[PDB]
Amino acid sequence: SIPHLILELLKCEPDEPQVQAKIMAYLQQEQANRSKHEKLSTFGLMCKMADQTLFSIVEWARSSIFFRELKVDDQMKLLQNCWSELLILDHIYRQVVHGKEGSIFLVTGQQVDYSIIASQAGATLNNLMSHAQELVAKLRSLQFDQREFVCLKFLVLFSLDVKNLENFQLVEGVQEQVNAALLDYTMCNYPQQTEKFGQLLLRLPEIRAISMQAEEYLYYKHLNGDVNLLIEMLHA
Template sequence: MLTKLTLCSCSCFSPCPICGDKISGFHYGIFSCESCKGFFKRTVQNRKNYMCLRGGNCPVTVATRKKCPACRFDKCLGCGMKLEAIREDRTRGGRSTYQCSYTLSGAASTGSLLSAHAPTTLRHASSLTCVNGPGSYSSRGESSNSRLTPDIPPLLQEIMDVEHLWQYNESELSRMSKSTGSPSANPLLAASGITAQNSSADFLADLCNIADHRLYKIVKWCKSLPLFKNISIDDQICLLINSWCELLVLSCCYRGVSTPGEVRVGGGRGITLHQSAKYGLTPCIERMLSFTDHLRRLRVDRYEYVALKVIVLLTSDAPELREAEKVRASQEKALAALQAYTAAHSPDTPAKFGELLLRIPELQRTCQFFMQVGKEMLNPANKGKDGEGPSFNLLMELLRGDH
């Protein structure tokens, strides 16, 4: 193992591990070029949410680094750049308390640098922020985690206290089992602007019927959340329209953590990869199973799960929000609670908080893919005027009504 001084000396003649440009110094945990340093800083501070349109495998070189910011940010994280090294006050200079992530192999003489901590499952970070709360970093770069106790953050306990609103009782399960899978009788399927034409669509209609029942539960749950009550009704509608699919998929995947190889869709039902082939849903179920595997690998517990749901719900970049700052402030409270909890209950895995947040954009991509496949299986119908999409009258009615 080379000394840090020798490593720094060798690195001056090495290419940037992200794009191959000339290294300008030690930035946010790794040696990198000035361009990638600035890109990483802007992405984190401005809370950019990038998405790759080419499958997430774009080459990142000096010539192509500006073409796909999503893959470039992925590579920054994969090479070892640290989110927590970005200053919260936007002042110049990153924190210098982070050791280099590199070790040099025998190929060091050729200027090759290898990251010692390059994970293979990092995804795009969405709405990541250094939260000013328990477990965050002070302006001196010192962790305040040592002050934490294993107690549950009060906000997280309040969120857990309303989690029972997601659960079904026996009579509700009975009614669900008797419900028809006909798309025409299904509010969610009708609201989605699609109609069934084949057996695969009939199966999807059954899934939508389950999801429709779950929507009532979601709305009751939302209206009881401490962070949701103070948001205007119009913004509540925007948030639910923006996140209902993510909430449903996240709950299905979390229920499947205890049943490897099977996605639990609710109502006691599940679907395996083999079964999904009959309905043309294999790509969707593959993605959901992959997401479930990540939850299982991270050993996500119920407190982390309910916190993730709230963070997903309170996405401040949802279109047509009237009070985005208010929503963002609420989300940051949930982020602070989750950060404090993971720091206290998973001290041996300090990266868990960041990895949990990195699952959110992966969840969003899974939902986008699922909805795209669903609409390809089904014919568009019941569209609004001028080709508009679904009106989501069900969500509006439930939120404005006393249910």
């Protein structure tokens, strides 16, 4: 069975084909615009891809249960704290579902060879991507499913590490009830893996660590002149 709370979370999930189709189409018109001598760098197009994913993440949150009851200033504080975590969690789950050995699946629906990306990404990004791939492998070995994914999405969004909230009690309550629903769901649907609940929860600090290091690297690249909504989220 599925706890009713998780069913409510599953309702709020975006239409993933249309989300991916819209981002794919955006990137195509941007390239189709540019002339021979003003191609985008590989890093630049990944930033635009992340930028467009962020737009869809904000629209997802704004219409989600619980989040839509917060005042907008509370909503901004929550998203400013977790936007990079949500991007990384979305990337990781995409590899869990669709990933094949030696390739990366993008939000556009494209599959790209790891050797191509690793040639261009540089040492820092390659390290962070390898750390993320280690999480993909663990989550795949645990049979990470969509119900657990949406739980982790809300646990990331409703972070106890956000201050100066008007309604911190709601964030505290959502964190507690989603935790309790995930504990119940894993026990009922995967009764033989005692470790699953704890292994899922321990990926959250790891995703947080990858996410914050990714933010710091992106800030460096911006200050270096190598990089929209993405920049706005970095500054705030």
